[PDB]
Amino acid sequence: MSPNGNLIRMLVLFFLESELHEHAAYLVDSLWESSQELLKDWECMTELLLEEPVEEAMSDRQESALIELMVCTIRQAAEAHPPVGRGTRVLTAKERKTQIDDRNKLTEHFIITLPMLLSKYSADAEKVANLLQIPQYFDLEIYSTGRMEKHLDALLKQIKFVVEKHVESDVLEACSKTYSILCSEEYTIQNRVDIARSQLIDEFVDRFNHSVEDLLQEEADDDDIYNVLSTLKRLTSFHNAHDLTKWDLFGNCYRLLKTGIEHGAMPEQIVVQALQCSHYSILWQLVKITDGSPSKEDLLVLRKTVKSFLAVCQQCLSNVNTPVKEQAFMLLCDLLMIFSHQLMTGGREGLQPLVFNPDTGLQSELLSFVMDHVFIDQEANKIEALHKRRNLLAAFSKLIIYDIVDMHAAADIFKHYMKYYNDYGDIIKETLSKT
Ligand SMILES: Cc1ccc(NC(=O)c2ccccc2C)c(O)c1
């Protein structure tokens, strides 16, 4: 009760104070054979996080660490195997009997408790985003069984509160996934969740649309810019896993982008988002046309939209801000691969009119950006910045293999930059071997 509250309050210390476990998930896994009972006392944890102290309190850092360890205990219990990167795998009678029971306990528990956790820590992005990893492991049918409808409203009350307080990519993406999980995976609750959502959205589209109109008509306030980007972000986040096509968002994005090309004076994050949103709008328009039995005008309407957007993305390569160029490029290398001749695979030859071949002028810019923004001259930030350029190239690499860009002009650049490996490599190899 308080005995297990000591063991866990010291476990959060042993993890934070010693460098002996860098990864929470690995720590929990290592103790799991020996210390399962203790590590599945979720009532003990949720207590320590919600209670007020008598004496000694918890530190913001230690709180964050309990939340993180907790989620890792919830996963290991649900999945009933060591985490990604410690695995090997056939449960026995009892192992499976235990798993079902653990899933029951953490669902029955967290349905009640997770609304309250979110409540208290509502403004802590890192904490909120880590708590929202928990529903995926719910036995969601129990939002019926336990007559627990009151608590599902309570999660949704709190998820609404978070998205309304937050603009960080981690929180919103975390909130979005949670809605996807609460939806599809049991009809019983699907209808209730669907409404809380499409009302959540409506409030944000009305807010975005007014902001957009505010911005463009205006001299343009620091607020005008706050409001446009603030709302857009919430919607872009959601539009990846949520089919927001019914709200014509592509329209206002396309205006913001067009205003930022024209008068050259659109803030860099508005543009990047405005893009990423448009792109999600387009992918969703495509799916409805793939799975439907679509008409001639249908194809030709989406086509006109795609060709107008491919031009925006191309144009946005010229934007001063390199975050824009990177996005612009990343979408160009995606879109040109999607609306390639591959689109006519699986007897879907009806889609010919959608296919796009990128011109010389565009191909010469898709080379430009590589030479300028992959292959540059000159701590934690830089290993991350590298894997990005890596991805930017790997996504351009796909266009080279299927001759969507001039493959010869590309390999000529790959010559020019790999020179010092062709020209001096052997000599540097055998040298470093003998030291
Ligand atoms: C995703 C995202 C990023 C940034 C912002 N907002 C701001 O940057 C902002 C707003 C008003 C006054 C000062 C600042 C710095 C936002 O709303 C959404």
Side-chain angles (χ1 to χ4, degrees), residues 167-169 172 222-223 225-227 229-231 233-234 269 273:
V167 306
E168 301 100 8
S169 61
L172 301 179
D222 272 345
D223 253 291
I225 302 156
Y226 175 59
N227 296 286
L229 184 62
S230 32
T231 41
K233 298 293 304 198
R234 270 107 161 182
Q269 261 316 277
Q273 289 299 300

Side-chain angles (χ1 to χ4, degrees), residues 2-12:
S2 258
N4 260 348
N6 276 153
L7 285 187
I8 271 141
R9 257 290 287 271
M10 293 305 140
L11 193 63
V12 165

